[PDB]
Amino acid sequence: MENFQKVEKIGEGTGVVYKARNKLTGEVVALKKIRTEGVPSTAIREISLLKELNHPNIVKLLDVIHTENKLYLVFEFLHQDLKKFMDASALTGIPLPLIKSYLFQLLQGLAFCHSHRVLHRDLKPQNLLINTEGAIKLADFGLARAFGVPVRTYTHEVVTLWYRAPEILLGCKYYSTAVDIWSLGCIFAEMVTRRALFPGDSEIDQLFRIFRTLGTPDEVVWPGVTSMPDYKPSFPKWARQDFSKVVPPLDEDGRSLLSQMLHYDPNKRISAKAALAHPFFQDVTKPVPHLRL
Numbered sequence: 245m246e247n248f249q250k251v252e253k254i255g256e257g258t259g260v261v262y263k264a265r266n267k268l269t270g271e272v273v274a275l276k277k278i279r280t281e282g283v284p285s286t287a288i289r290e291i292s293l294l295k296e297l298n299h300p301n302i303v304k305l306l307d308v309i310h311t312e313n314k315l316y317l318v319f320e321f322l323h324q325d326l327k328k329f330m331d332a333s334a335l336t337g338i339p340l341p342l343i344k345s346y347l348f349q350l351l352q353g354l355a356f357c358h359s360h361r362v363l364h365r366d367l368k369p370q371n372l373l374i375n376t377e378g379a380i381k382l383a384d385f386g387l388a389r390a391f392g393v394p395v396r397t398y399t400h401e402v403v404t405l406w407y408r409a410p411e412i413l414l415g416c417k418y419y420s421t422a423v424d425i426w427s428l429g430c431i432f433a434e435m436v437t438r439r440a441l442f443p444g445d446s447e448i449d450q451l452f453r454i455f456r457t458l459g460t461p462d463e464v465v466w467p468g469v470t471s472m473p474d475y476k477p478s479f480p481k482w483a484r485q486d487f488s489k490v491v492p493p494l495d496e497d498g499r500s501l502l503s504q505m506l507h508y509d510p511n512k513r514i515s516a517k518a519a520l521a522h523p524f525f526q527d528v529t530k531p532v533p534h535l536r537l
């Protein structure tokens with residue numbers, strides 16, 4: 245509209261996203277255009293609810309605009325995402341104190357969302373935004389299940405499966421808060437090793453990469469797994485690997501927490517609230533990151 249002044253095009257989110265300035269307030273925001281034969285009225289209501297979900301580690305949804313039947317989401321603006329920061333820190337690696345601070349903050353954000361019955365469902369480094377003060381915030385939220393499993397964006401883009409929990413890959417129709425803990429565990433491992441934990445290039449390659457590392461799940465470690473929608477008795481049976489080999493040289497406090505975030509059974513997987521109490525965070529601090537904007 246005329247209330248906004250486009251500053252630049254940020255990219256092609258999971259719709260198009262622009263950095264824009266509000267002429268009235270003068271505030272700089274991120275404007276996402278969501279492209280469809282009437283724009284569901286059940287969604288606009290669900291979205292409108294997220295406007296009240298405020299927390300320091302959650303990107304604020306400032307406004308929802310339906311006018312013109314285009315549907316625009318206005319978000320608070322942050323300059324960089326964790327994916328770019330990790331690439332920039334590839335040579336030296338993000339310092340452990342900062343990795344710990346970020347993980348701690350993200351768990352606080354998840355604990356808040358989960359206590360308000362809000363799930364993210366599509367956590368990935370590109371959806372974690374950071375600023376110069378050392379803060380990190382959860383963004384996007386997959387649009388509150390508005391768009392289920394997006395195979396291609398408005399211009400056909402390859403959906404990342406790297407952070408998908410095993411129960412989703414096995415066809416479970418009801419996601420629980422545990423899917424977000426799994427994704428965050430994968431991100432924690434990636435910050436530590438500087439390599440994606442499970443970089444699959446297809447749904448089955450994703451599932452098999454998980455099995456090759458954590459062992460093919462069975463009824464002992466995951467009661468009910470063999471009855472899941474897409475489970476096949478023909479899956480190969482791989483033995484589990486030790487975490488000392490998976491995320492070296494992370495210490496035992498870190499390995500212990502990661503192991504709990506990656507349990508196969510969603511019911512055994514640690515909650516965000518419980519993870520905040522883990523010994524790994526006894527010495528947590530809030531360092532300032534080296535950001536080049």
Ligand SMILES: NC(=O)c1cc([N+](=O)[O-])c(NCCN2CCNCC2)cc1NCc1cnc(N)nc1
Pocket residue numbers: 254255256257258261263274275276303319320321322323324325370371373383384
């Ligand atoms: N709230 C925001 O400031 C913000 C919002 C969105 N968004 O989507 O509304 C966004 N898009 C990222 C698109 N992806 C998410 C889905 N997986 C692929 C990556 C980026 C943002 N900021 C960080 C940033 C700023 N500037 C440049 N150039 N790059 C990044």
